[PDB]
Amino acid sequence: LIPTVIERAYDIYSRLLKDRIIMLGSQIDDNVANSIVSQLLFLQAQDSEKDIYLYINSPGGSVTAGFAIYDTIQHIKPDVQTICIGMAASMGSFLLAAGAKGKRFALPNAEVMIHQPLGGAQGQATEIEIAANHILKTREKLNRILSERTGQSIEKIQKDTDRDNFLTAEEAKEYGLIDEVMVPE
Amino acid sequence: LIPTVIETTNRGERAYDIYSRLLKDRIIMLGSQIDDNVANSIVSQLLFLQAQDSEKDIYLYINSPGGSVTAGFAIYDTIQHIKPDVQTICIGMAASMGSFLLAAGAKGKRFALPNAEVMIHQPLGGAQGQATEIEIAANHILKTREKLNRILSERTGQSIEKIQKDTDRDNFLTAEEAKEYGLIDEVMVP
Amino acid sequence: LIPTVIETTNRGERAYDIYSRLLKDRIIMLGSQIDDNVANSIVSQLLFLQAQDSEKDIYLYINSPGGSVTAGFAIYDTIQHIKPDVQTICIGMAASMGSFLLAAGAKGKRFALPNAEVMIHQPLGGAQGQATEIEIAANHILKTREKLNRILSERTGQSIEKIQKDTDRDNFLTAEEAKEYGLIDEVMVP
Amino acid sequence: LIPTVIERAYDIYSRLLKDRIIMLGSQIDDNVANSIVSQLLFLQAQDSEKDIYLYINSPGGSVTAGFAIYDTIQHIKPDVQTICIGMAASMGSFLLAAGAKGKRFALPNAEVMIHQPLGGAQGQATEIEIAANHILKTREKLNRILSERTGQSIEKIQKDTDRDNFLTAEEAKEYGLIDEVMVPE
Amino acid sequence: LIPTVIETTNRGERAYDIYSRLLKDRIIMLGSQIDDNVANSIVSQLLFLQAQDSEKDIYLYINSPGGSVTAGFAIYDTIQHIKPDVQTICIGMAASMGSFLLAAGAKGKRFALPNAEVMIHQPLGGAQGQATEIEIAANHILKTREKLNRILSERTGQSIEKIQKDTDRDNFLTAEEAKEYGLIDEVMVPE
Amino acid sequence: LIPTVIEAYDIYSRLLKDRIIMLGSQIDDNVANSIVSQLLFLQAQDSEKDIYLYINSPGGSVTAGFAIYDTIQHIKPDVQTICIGMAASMGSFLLAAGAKGKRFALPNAEVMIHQPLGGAQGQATEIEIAANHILKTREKLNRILSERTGQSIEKIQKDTDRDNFLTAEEAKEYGLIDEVMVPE
Amino acid sequence: LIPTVIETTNRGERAYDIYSRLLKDRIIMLGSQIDDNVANSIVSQLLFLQAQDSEKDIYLYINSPGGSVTAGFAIYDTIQHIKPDVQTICIGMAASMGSFLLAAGAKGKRFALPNAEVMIHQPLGGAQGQATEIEIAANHILKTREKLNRILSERTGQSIEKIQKDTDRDNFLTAEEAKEYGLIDEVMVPET
Amino acid sequence: IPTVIAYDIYSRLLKDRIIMLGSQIDDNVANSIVSQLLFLQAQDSEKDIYLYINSPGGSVTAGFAIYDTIQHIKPDVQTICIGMAASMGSFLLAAGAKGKRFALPNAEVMIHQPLGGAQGQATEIEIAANHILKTREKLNRILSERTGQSIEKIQKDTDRDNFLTAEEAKEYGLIDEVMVPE
Amino acid sequence: LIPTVIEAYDIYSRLLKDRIIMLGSQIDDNVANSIVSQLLFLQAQDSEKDIYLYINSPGGSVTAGFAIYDTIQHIKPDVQTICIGMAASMGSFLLAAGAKGKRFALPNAEVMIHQPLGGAQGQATEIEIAANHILKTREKLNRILSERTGQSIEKIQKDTDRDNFLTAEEAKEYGLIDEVMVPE
Ligand SMILES: CC[C@H](C)[C@H]1C(=O)N(Cc2cccc3ccccc23)C[C@@H]2N(C(=O)NCCCC(F)(F)F)CCC(=O)N12
Ligand SMILES: CC[C@H](C)[C@H]1C(=O)N(Cc2cccc3ccccc23)C[C@@H]2N(C(=O)NCCCC(F)(F)F)CCC(=O)N12
Ligand SMILES: CC[C@H](C)[C@H]1C(=O)N(Cc2cccc3ccccc23)C[C@@H]2N(C(=O)NCCCC(F)(F)F)CCC(=O)N12
Ligand SMILES: CC[C@H](C)[C@H]1C(=O)N(Cc2cccc3ccccc23)C[C@@H]2N(C(=O)NCCCC(F)(F)F)CCC(=O)N12
Ligand SMILES: CC[C@H](C)[C@H]1C(=O)N(Cc2cccc3ccccc23)C[C@@H]2N(C(=O)NCCCC(F)(F)F)CCC(=O)N12
Ligand SMILES: CC[C@H](C)[C@H]1C(=O)N(Cc2cccc3ccccc23)C[C@@H]2N(C(=O)NCCCC(F)(F)F)CCC(=O)N12
Ligand SMILES: CC[C@H](C)[C@H]1C(=O)N(Cc2cccc3ccccc23)C[C@@H]2N(C(=O)NCCCC(F)(F)F)CCC(=O)N12
Ligand SMILES: CC[C@H](C)[C@H]1C(=O)N(Cc2cccc3ccccc23)C[C@@H]2N(C(=O)NCCCC(F)(F)F)CCC(=O)N12
Ligand SMILES: CC[C@H](C)[C@H]1C(=O)N(Cc2cccc3ccccc23)C[C@@H]2N(C(=O)NCCCC(F)(F)F)CCC(=O)N12
Ligand SMILES: [Mg+2]
Ligand SMILES: [Mg+2]
Ligand SMILES: [Mg+2]
Ligand SMILES: [Mg+2]
Ligand SMILES: [Mg+2]
Ligand SMILES: [Mg+2]
Ligand SMILES: [Mg+2]
Ligand SMILES: [Mg+2]
């Protein structure tokens, strides 16, 4: 049950969108990506100069869906701020790190997790090889961009994402995944 | 079936579902298990209410068995970030992350009704796979408990040691006991 | 399929689902098993009706087999907190936490229709795990029963000892027997 | 798919309710009872003197839910006519018999069935005893009211409801469950 | 996996599964939930043993949560019918119809080991359908309870009223408490 | 789920107002019918202005894909194609089907090409019919892909034998798209 | 698939499944979760062994995660009732009621092999229904715990209080730690 | 299972002191193998026993039942890997009498860290984590002793699934020799 | 229902008395353990007389197959292989592993060769380990098949890329068997 606000009637999320706030509040799949991409394109058309605010409370999900959002963020004119509230894990933390430089935030008790991509492969040896080569290339792609966005080496990113790596908001700032911990007003 | 209320309000007539009507008077309902959807909604409502009026109190109704710790912390951090005081009112039950959020309301403005139940306990989780994966999961949930216990100590005035001991198992408190503990400030009487 | 009713005003025809139409005249329907969703809705309706008119009676219709004790206490405490008298009217059945809420209506304004069924019994629950966990769960449900019995004693005029004995097993009462017991004040005749 | 009628757009059932017609067209549960009770209360408030029409096409259902409807019918001022179309069985036929005296009808090919209440009990001997005593008292309550409404003895009602007893509309009139078979006009 | 024991006898070597070996020595194992299969087996063993020797004691081991009342009464009536004394020995647990059968052993020869658990409670059942069917089922289980209580009164020396009250809910007894109650005669102490 | 914008439109309907169609899911008949209807509507609205087909899709039904393909080729306006996230299978086929010079992908978008998938069960002659059908369908797909990319049918056959993942730049090199759309 | 062993006797050639062969030399295998079937079998074997020889030691092998408390007490009481000493030997694991039985072996004849795992914890159970039914179930499991702890105190030399504290949660012990605790007498070291 | 004349084939092999570990290791398998070892010892305390290993591993405690019984008894227990030894299976392969641990040339040996699970309260998860970590240390220490490799190296090499050929297993010290065709 | 013969033997045990082993099912560890035990037993009984391995099998576990393979090569006696019905996958591998000159198939027996099948799930590095493992296993299989057939590793790789069904005569031509056993 999503509440409605009247001032024109808006569901609460649509009301936030009126003030250029986009909610990434779920597992990332193609539906979520298509919606966020559409919202980004709409907000750019509305105003190419004003900041956009991407709220992130997400365990991650599809890498290609994540890259749909990533590429649209980088394509458009306006700065897209990222703010981690609750959790950003996996492709969620990747998108957190993808916000406009100097405008990537987390609230003090927000959790950030980084790890290597997950997948599956079944069938013939050559099919397994193709799937393995694909996920390994995808991992190099992710690591390269994360290196660029954080200032950490690809070597360090590889090592630090080998297993689940949980970071506090302050640790995420130290790592270069965010720029600042947003403290209470 | 959520009922609708219709008001003839000077500039015309407006129809509200009952929860949206409560939101018009700065009342947010945390009335279910805490997951990311619930957290996203409450966070959005908090941000909206601050924008509407940065000074007037917000009222967070809590009837919840708790749920996701990270989802709970989304709500917690948004409460602490915004300018307005967020009152918390426990009606029915606040358990687990629900009682954590009850304790997170503005100092002096945390309430429970007389027969409301408050329960505190340690976080729950799971881990499967390799020994090193189990270790990572264990270290994570232990650090999460320390985080929770530290904040609860700050909010209640109880020591971290006492919080640890009192949350080892399920600990059910009456509204009055929750006040004594420092989880709330007052039992709201008729 | 819930029917819609349309009433013609000067600024248009206002359309109501039948339950929302009843709410316009301060009638709240407790017509299902009591869970947190039902409790949150009823609590919200009570708060809304008080704000709308702090003096006029509210009418709580009860056709319910009961359900969650904490959800029931959410409704109970909200009834006792608000200014207006909340009349209770049992139609069909009030069982368990449903009969508790029937007995919780404003003194002199608790009713049942002549063929309505009222049932009282002890709380139901479950516990699994370690011996100390079972002990905690047992102590909790026993304390919950004491609370329920104490309040029922206050509301009915019966002794706690009698309430304990009469709720040991399922105890079915006619409307007239419920009046004799003190669970209601009057059998509403045609 | 329930059709809409425009004169005020109404779903067909809401349109019938505008002319004081209530549809009991399903198995009787608490939801159905709450709705019918609310409709009865609303119609009384609208006009305390004009007849209400209760359409009955129902296999019956919950006895307590049925008694919610029954007591509300008897409580309110207006006469509630009952009209059996298709079938009235069990608590459905009980409610058919509960309509205003002289205003209980069935169409010629409508089926009326009467039988004893159904239930269940599991657990300890004393629990089974409580459940048995409860359903037996419920049966006595039903039979007593049916006797009053039909003019048949409690003894006869007991015997005739021991097993499933199917009646034609004409037989239901003879029995005293209805007053008239509504013939074509 | 039930182990086998092999003995050299006078007429050759003989192989027994462990339970069949115990039966050779007039020991019957009631070691499971009581259903008709269990009852038929125990009844057959009792009849066989009685034929083997109408005089020598039989030993009924009881580690059972109870079960079917009629199946229990098959065992009960066969015990009472046959000539030999049937000793009863509770090891682990006797609950419900299991404790009834424990109490049904030969007077003076009903035992429990010190940490054995004895539980008594009222019969359990179910009924669904028409009101008159529910009435028949209720009357049946109530009459069955009386029958059980009457016999338990006779075997324990407790009043029917006390039995009724003490079996209203689950009533767990230690071996010593079961002796005090009259369900057994002695707590068998270590030799 | 889907936010509303007021200037009231759901976000996707708002994009459709500016001639943007979203192919953002697995391709089935429902998706195809919707996209076909949108294409026909946009042509009727303006026969000369470009249409923009967003593609984030793992592919799906070949016949549903061909419903979209044929409608694109039938209508007057140029249909630009833009791969964002992923285009796989029939999704990449449709990406390659956009107006010549107006097929794009964003830099980190993934393009995958492979042979059609299917099933057959029953009698030997039924299996033969199903096999002949899917083989003819593959030839149809390969022929069109050859025409659209400039690659030989022989090369297409070889390169689609197994799953073949391409970067946006590789897709441009292959002739599946015309340009990698760089940040503005 | 349980293998068979054949030994040639004087009055013929005799075949045993491997477990039955071990039983011939007074070895009983508690090698599974403890339920009533397992208890009934072990009780029968103990009675049989006692009858066969009231004086020679019996060897109870324990590789078990535990299980039913009442089934465990069937085995426990039979061990204490019979004449012969019952040695206990933990190989692999003894947990819960399994450890309880390990500790119940003849004094001085309770063993574990060096890498065997011993676990102690409080009893587990369930209860559902009316408040008074839950109370009865709670009182029952609590009394059962007290019974277990009292006997464990007697068998180990540890106080009931220490046992209560050390069984509050899962407590894993090495064979050497189990000896130190008093659950066993000796760690059986490899032979010459 | 075929019969030879009467013995089932496995019981016939047991007559010549051959024990088959040919399945996933659970308590039933461990109890059987332990019983066979004890029996063979009683039959002859001096003659070698032959433990065939074609197993994906399984329960660590069940594996240790077999391990401790092997080390307790007098006779040397040869180990022979045929097909596969993985996990606790390779642990037992390495546990055979020194100089008498073998694999056939195409046999596969796999080593990795123990697997497990934990659910419930934070303190319960901590207990479970500490338990599996201790268990890993126990396994690694013994493997170090049996192979001559350092505990540090074992830890590194078992972090993920590590597949070895028979020759590589010999090089590692898990076996002594690759048994070549007669 | 396996019939009994009295001269008492179940039919398969009777065949084993004459040094005939039946590989008549999917290859798993149980099947491998049984066949290994039978091979060891027979050798003990007579180190010089031929053993006959009947193969009617769709294949199965590669490691289980290698248990049988290595035991065949280890023991002294020649192990003849005879394909009746079908030998597929690891089944055809074992058919090819029989004593040189003593590998047979009946005229209508079917022989199928293909690459190994498997699965992998989890982290990228776990998928890599699983991929490297199955690829090394394939190389091992291909190398041995090359040695046993006289075909090049390159040809084996190409011919096992997909399911490759061969007649008994084609299997002889390939070098998987030595002779097609004709009616006597
Ligand atoms: C030159 C601008 C972009 C690059 C170009 C174009 O490539 N696409 C394809 C496209 C489709 C969908 C998502 C995309 C995300 C990133 C990049 C391209 C995307 C649509 C866009 N349009 C708008 O934005 N129109 C303004 C209204 C927008 C609103 F959302 F409000 F409808 C239509 C006019 C047009 O030329 N382009
Ligand atoms: C107080 C947050 C700061 C000032 C900042 C910013 O960080 N975020 C990111 C954000 C996104 C989502 C949830 C957040 C919760 C806590 C903190 C930040 C959150 C959006 C916010 N905006 C509004 O609130 N705009 C007024 C309209 C608000 C309404 F809800 F009504 F739409 C847009 C203008 C802006 O600078 N910020
Ligand atoms: C009468 C003072 C109550 C005690 C106080 C307060 O504690 N709460 C928290 C609360 C939240 C939810 C349910 C509650 C039930 C019982 C008691 C408190 C409850 C909300 C309430 N508000 C209203 O009722 N506003 C009038 C409009 C109400 C309407 F429903 F129409 F929106 C907001 C202003 C306020 O100070 N309080
Ligand atoms: C003297 C009328 C009854 C006795 C009395 C009262 O007891 N109840 C409780 C009640 C609640 C629900 C169902 C009931 C069925 C039968 C009897 C009582 C029922 C509500 C009713 N109300 C209306 O009918 N108001 C007119 C508007 C009604 C409309 F439906 F249109 F909203 C509110 C004013 C009031 O005093 N009472
Ligand atoms: C005391 C039983 C009476 C005298 C009688 C008789 O009623 N029944 C029926 C019967 C059947 C089954 C169970 C019974 C249990 C209790 C009572 C009767 C039962 C069989 C019995 N027989 C034996 O016991 N024969 C000796 C051999 C017995 C052995 F078990 F070893 F086979 C056959 C000769 C005979 O007259 N009766
Ligand atoms: C393309 C037009 C063709 C030649 C012709 C015709 O074949 N079809 C069948 C048809 C049906 C459905 C999808 C189709 C897709 C591609 C081709 C044909 C399709 C309908 C169309 N109409 C419109 O487009 N009318 C303008 C309004 C359109 C709007 F979408 F806005 F409603 C009706 C007048 C008419 O002659 N034709
Ligand atoms: C020490 C047991 C006492 C003396 C006594 C007795 O109480 N029970 C009941 C009983 C039944 C089942 C399990 C029991 C476990 C512990 C204690 C008693 C148990 C049977 C036993 N019998 C034997 O052991 N007979 C020797 C043969 C034994 C063999 F196993 F081989 F068959 C029959 C002769 C007898 O008097 N008693
Ligand atoms: C002094 C030897 C050992 C130390 C001692 C003892 O501790 N156990 C317990 C035990 C039980 C089960 C498995 C065990 C594995 C390893 C170590 C001990 C095990 C049984 C053993 N017995 C035999 O082996 N008897 C010879 C016959 C054996 C045969 F298998 F054939 F039955 C019984 C005589 C006895 O003193 N012991
Ligand atoms: C040629 C294997 C050598 C000589 C050696 C040895 O390594 N193993 C281990 C082993 C175990 C299981 C399967 C094996 C398969 C291939 C190779 C070794 C295998 C057992 C064998 N034995 C026999 O064969 N004994 C004769 C009786 C045989 C019979 F089957 F009939 F029981 C025991 C005496 C012995 O030294 N070895
Ligand atoms: Mg940007
Ligand atoms: Mg605040
Ligand atoms: Mg009030
Ligand atoms: Mg009336
Ligand atoms: Mg007798
Ligand atoms: Mg003893
Ligand atoms: Mg040794
Ligand atoms: Mg050979």
Residue numbers in the entry:
A (entry chain C), D (entry chain G): 3 to 9, 16 to 193
B (entry chain B), C (entry chain A): 3 to 192
E (entry chain I): 3 to 193
F (entry chain D), I (entry chain M): 3 to 9, 17 to 193
G (entry chain H): 3 to 194
H (entry chain N): 4 to 8, 17 to 193
Give passages from the manuscript.
Incorporation with the isoleucine fragment and 4,4,4-trifluorobutyl motif into the core scaffold of ICG-001 provided a potent ClpP activator ZG180. ZG180 is more potent than ICG-001 in activating SaClpP for α-casein hydrolysis, as evidenced by a 3-fold decrease in EC50. However, ZG180 also promotes HsClpP for α-casein hydrolysis, which indicates that ZG180 is also a global activator for both bacterial and mitochondrial ClpP proteins. Either ZG180/SaClpP or ZG180/HsClpP structure is a single tetradecamer composed of two stacked heptameric rings. Like the previously characterized ClpP activators, the binding of fourteen ZG180 molecules induces an open-gated state in the tetradecameric ClpP cylinders with an enlarged axis entrance pore. The apparent electron densities in the 2fo-fc and fo-fc omit maps unambiguously demonstrate ZG180 binding on the apical surface of SaClpP and HsClpP. The naphthyl motif and trifluorobutyl chain in ZG180 form hydrophobic stacking in the binding pockets of SaClpP, which contributes to the enhanced interactions. A network of hydrogen bonds between ZG180 and the side chains of D27, L49, Q52, Y61, and Q89 collectively increase the binding affinity to SaClpP. While SaClpP and HsClpP share a high similarity in the primary sequences, there is a large indole motif of W146 in HsClpP but a much smaller isopropyl side chain of I91 in SaClpP in the conserved position. Indeed, structural superimposition of the ZG180/SaClpP and ZG180/HsClpP complexes also reveals that the α-carbon of the naphthyl motif in ZG180 is likely to be a discriminant site for introducing steric clash against the bulky side chain of W146 in HsClpP.
ClpP is a highly conserved protease regulated by ATPases in bacteria and in mitochondria. In bacteria, ClpP is responsible for modulating the expression of virulence factors, antibiotic resistance, and the formation of biofilms and persisters. Likewise, Homo sapiens ClpP (HsClpP), which is found in the mitochondria, is a key protease regulating mitochondrial proteins homeostasis. The dysfunction of ClpP by small molecule activators has recently been demonstrated to be a possible method of discovering antibacterial and anticancer drugs.
